[PDB]
Design a protein around this ligand. Structure first.
Ligand code: CA
Ligand code: CA
Ligand code: CA
Ligand code: CA
Ligand code: CA
Ligand code: CA
Ligand code: CA
Ligand code: CA
Lengths: 114, 114, 114, 114
């Protein structure tokens, strides 16, 4: 099934943060309404934050995360979790190799903010 | 029910990250084996990362997240999600006031790393 | 924090199902827009599916699960998970005692149907 | 990524329940320790339960769910959720066609039981 795609409330601020756990450089693209709203690029084998920013879901509220290592798209796993019917987490894991640890690039989206 | 307590596999490196979304200064304390392993303190209404570190679950494997605002303990909400039976996320939300948005201090724990 | 409350898309049908794992008779109430729309009850320590029914979220989309044993409300734990940004599960666990297994009455809400 | 495979505690009882929402007859296979341990077959377009049983996770604890409709393997989506660090949910959604509602056969695994 498709992974890394989330529908947030329209015109809503949300945070997006990416961590890296791979020898290779991670390039994370965050799409809002099919348009690149943010890009994070970095390398780390110790869960470093290669990017964190605040974005706005916009009209469609459609947000999609994509990860690639040297142009090659990583396989993704994802899910959305809501706590006490108010706090939202859109979670993404990505695998750029074969060991299937799916942490090479970890992306955490959360909302609402403030 | 008890919230903010997580049983991770023993002696395992994990990442812990806190975000702030409140008018009040958040104090996020991370306990491992019931000992303070890290403490983040910060104020923000725009999801600033007031702290992120890589800790080791230790021999016990017990990780607890505590949040307080100026000495007053916040109410916590939490859960753990596992993707593709391998990628783990321990999620924590906290409420320091009366609006119940539970984002005042958001904490995310992820593993495995590397 | 409040538990057992879920906001479903408006006027959408969903399935609600209850499971029992306790020596005490479980009584599960499902409120839609603050009015009970379904009630299940039974006594099993072998995960018996004590009841299931298709309901409509109505205009409010608000759904709440309440669990009581012999007139006393049980402590609740819950969360919502979304898969492939399409399949929704609203989960509820309940504890009518102190042995901390929170399975005395388990309720699963899923949608969309059809 | 791999889906429908869950690592439960070993030699532990768990419940597996399947619901159907499709014109096609669903065949749900549950394997334990790499051997089919249970099979549910049924049809429903109203979320009716097509099977529910209590099984043992075997020596490795590995439990795998596979769904097919007339020989054709349905695409799976899944995740595990843990509430209050003790109540577990292994969720599976399956798509036997192209409309991608992933509810054709919905499978819920829960533990502990009793
Ligand atoms: Ca990898
Ligand atoms: Ca890695
Ligand atoms: Ca608040
Ligand atoms: Ca807040
Ligand atoms: Ca109990
Ligand atoms: Ca019980
Ligand atoms: Ca379908
Ligand atoms: Ca269907």
């Amino acid at each position: 099934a498709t992974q890394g795609v989330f529908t947030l409330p329209a015109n809503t601020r949300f945070g997006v943060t990416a961590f890296a756990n791979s020898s290779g450089t991670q390039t994370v693209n965050v799409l809002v309404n099919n348009e690149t709203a943010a890009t994070f690029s970095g390398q780390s084998t110790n869960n470093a934050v290669i990017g964190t920013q605040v974005l706005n879901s916009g009209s469609s509220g459609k947000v999609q995360v994509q990860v690639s290592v040297n142009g090659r798209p990583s396989d993704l796993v994802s899910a959305q979790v809501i706590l006490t019917n108010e706090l939202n987490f859109a979670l993404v894991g990505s695998e750029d190799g074969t060991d299937n640890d799916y942490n090479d690039a970890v992306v955490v989206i959360n909302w609402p903010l403030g």
